[PDB]
Design an enzyme around this catalytic site. Sequence first.
Site, PDB file in Angstrom:
ATOM      1  N   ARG A  74      -4.028  -9.755   5.235  1.00 55.29           N
ATOM      2  CA  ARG A  74      -4.336  -9.931   3.828  1.00 55.29           C
ATOM      3  C   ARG A  74      -3.169  -9.422   2.978  1.00 55.29           C
ATOM      4  NH1 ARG A  74      -6.475  -6.853  -0.368  1.00 55.29           N
ATOM      5  NH2 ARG A  74      -7.869  -8.054  -1.740  1.00 55.29           N
TER       6      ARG A  74
ATOM      7  N   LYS B  74       0.814  -1.212   0.000  1.00 58.33           N
ATOM      8  CA  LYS B  74       0.000   0.000   0.000  1.00 58.33           C
ATOM      9  C   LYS B  74       0.853   1.270   0.000  1.00 58.33           C
ATOM     10  CE  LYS B  74      -4.632  -1.671   1.118  1.00 58.33           C
ATOM     11  NZ  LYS B  74      -5.856  -1.572   1.909  1.00 58.33           N
TER      12      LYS B  74
HETATM   13  C1  LIG Z   1     -11.213  -6.914  -0.562  1.00 60.97           C
HETATM   14  N1  LIG Z   1     -10.156  -5.946  -0.365  1.00 60.97           N
HETATM   15  N2  LIG Z   1      -9.455  -5.396  -1.478  1.00 60.97           N
HETATM   16  C2  LIG Z   1      -8.400  -4.433  -1.299  1.00 60.97           C
HETATM   17  C3  LIG Z   1      -7.768  -4.026  -2.627  1.00 60.97           C
HETATM   18  N3  LIG Z   1      -6.981  -2.850  -2.572  1.00 60.97           N
HETATM   19  C4  LIG Z   1      -7.813  -1.718  -2.844  1.00 60.97           C
HETATM   20  N4  LIG Z   1      -9.102  -1.811  -3.207  1.00 60.97           N
HETATM   21  N5  LIG Z   1      -9.560  -0.555  -3.381  1.00 60.97           N
HETATM   22  N6  LIG Z   1      -8.552   0.296  -3.116  1.00 60.97           N
HETATM   23  N7  LIG Z   1      -7.454  -0.430  -2.780  1.00 60.97           N
HETATM   24  C5  LIG Z   1      -7.994  -3.973   0.060  1.00 60.97           C
HETATM   25  O1  LIG Z   1      -7.126  -3.175   0.212  1.00 60.97           O
HETATM   26  C6  LIG Z   1      -8.712  -4.544   1.224  1.00 60.97           C
HETATM   27  C7  LIG Z   1      -8.427  -4.164   2.659  1.00 60.97           C
HETATM   28  O2  LIG Z   1      -7.603  -3.396   3.001  1.00 60.97           O
HETATM   29  N8  LIG Z   1      -9.195  -4.788   3.687  1.00 60.97           N
HETATM   30  C8  LIG Z   1     -10.249  -5.767   3.407  1.00 60.97           C
HETATM   31  N9  LIG Z   1     -11.020  -6.366   4.451  1.00 60.97           N
HETATM   32  N10 LIG Z   1     -10.511  -6.152   2.039  1.00 60.97           N
HETATM   33  C9  LIG Z   1      -9.770  -5.517   0.985  1.00 60.97           C
END
Ligand SMILES: Cn1nc(CNc2nnn[nH]2)c(=O)c2c(=O)[nH]c(N)nc21
EC number: 2.5.1.15
Lengths: 254, 265
Positions: free
Chosen positions: A234, A200
């Site tokens: 994650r 990130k």
């Molecule tokens: C499902 N998901 N996807 C991302 C992908 N990265 C992102 N999406 N939109 N902007 N950046 C993500 O970062 C996360 C997170 O941080 N937490 C949790 N629970 N699910 C996430």
Amino acid sequence: GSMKLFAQGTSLDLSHPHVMGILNVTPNSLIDAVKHANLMINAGATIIDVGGESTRGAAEVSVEEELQRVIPVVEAIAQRFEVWISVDTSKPEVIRESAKVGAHIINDIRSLSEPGALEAAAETGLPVCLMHMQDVFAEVNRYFIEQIARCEQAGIAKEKLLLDPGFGFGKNLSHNYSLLARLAEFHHFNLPLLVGMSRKSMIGQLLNVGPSERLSGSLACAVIAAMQGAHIIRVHDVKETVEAMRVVEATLSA
Amino acid sequence: GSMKLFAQGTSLDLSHPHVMGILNVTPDSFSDGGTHNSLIDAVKHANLMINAGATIIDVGGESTRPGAAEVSVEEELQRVIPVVEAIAQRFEVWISVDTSKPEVIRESAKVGAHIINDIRSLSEPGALEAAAETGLPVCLMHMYDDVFAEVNRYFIEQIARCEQAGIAKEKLLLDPGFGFGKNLSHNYSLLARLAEFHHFNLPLLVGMSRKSMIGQLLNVGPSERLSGSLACAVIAAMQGAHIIRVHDVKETVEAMRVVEATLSA
Ligand SMILES: Cn1nc(CNc2nnn[nH]2)c(=O)c2c(=O)[nH]c(N)nc21
Ligand SMILES: Cn1nc(CNc2nnn[nH]2)c(=O)c2c(=O)[nH]c(N)nc21
């Protein structure tokens, strides 16, 4: 410590950190997806996170497209492996169909804000991850209180809920680090904590490095979260993260 | 911003973690007086570590691999002194010297070393007196019914030993000695309780990089220990360890910056 989630007739033991491997299905392809799942399981992931809508000003997808991309992959993993499966979706129909084919966790970054999503989640009886999105600690804490209540009023039992403070997602560097520093305070809810810091910008902007140069900073964030008792981490790089978690586990065990 | 060490006309600010890059100049690494330009080799390596963000370079000329033959005083001087000198001339980093020999301690101080880092905690004849005479900072390293209590007691005794010889408490660093007569359980207990060693109000120095406590836990070889090393470094630093001794500087420095941003908040 004896904290557990139940889904699809199985249980996830949250007395130690779990690594959740990211499986992006926004780009035969089924077999590729399954082989990638296989690599992450062999690297030590105990949950595989399936997402079929990109979150990069990436293109929105219809219900039909998301069904076509996500459902066959969830199904193929449920048929091949004894691993937990999370699905990244905001759409009622995807929630219902994911549960039917064997998903364990609904991971909605929109925390079930789309019309019908809350009802669909309640009907599945699945665990649900609630993510805060765009004093930062007080704001995120308040958000959790509100979402728990929102979910309880919809019939979703408190024991089905996971909490994610939403690293990135309309948060500046200072705000990301405050949340990281105070992560343990979120245990007061007595719920599972899920975090996603991998690759990130809170690392990229701190170190002035591009997305492919963020491994070391990712590992540092994961270890800091896990030492504070975060339950699910994650990540894109499973093997390295799992090795880091083993060091954490040996430390916490002592 | 608070805790500091002083040496050679400069100061080391220990309000944040420092990465100490390992510079091995023993017979395991390089010839001495042969065809190879070992001096230039050593200094280029130091340079890469400094460019990667190390603020201390740890120079050692006697091997401590299980098989390794002990080196003469003259050979150790020939390996260590030119390297200490070259770094003190060129770069704005501190220099730590890994030696147990009085003569190398005295000569190192003359050419600009900042820290005496003896794994034997100055137990060799004359070492304590040589260290005291230099006025340099000194690292005390530990080398069970209760491992934490044994290391703690060891620290109390060595601080007093140093004090009695005229070394001020403000010159001392403490290192629990990871991997040093210690099994997996013992290593992890010390790591888990690292913060408790702050009661002494002294700098904490740790070295876990590429060690067996990682390799045996993960079943990975010495070239595949980076992730576990990083995890150890971060656990120590989040507990307020001051100096982290490592092989892989760039990655460690990145990890420390994440720690610093967390701790600051
Ligand atoms: C499902 N998901 N996807 C991302 C992908 N990265 C992102 N999406 N939109 N902007 N950046 C993500 O970062 C996360 C997170 O941080 N937490 C949790 N629970 N699910 C996430
Ligand atoms: C100088 N030095 N050297 C080593 C090399 N590893 C080793 N030596 N003998 N057996 N293993 C080391 O590990 C450390 C350490 O851990 N701390 C401190 N202060 N200095 C060390």
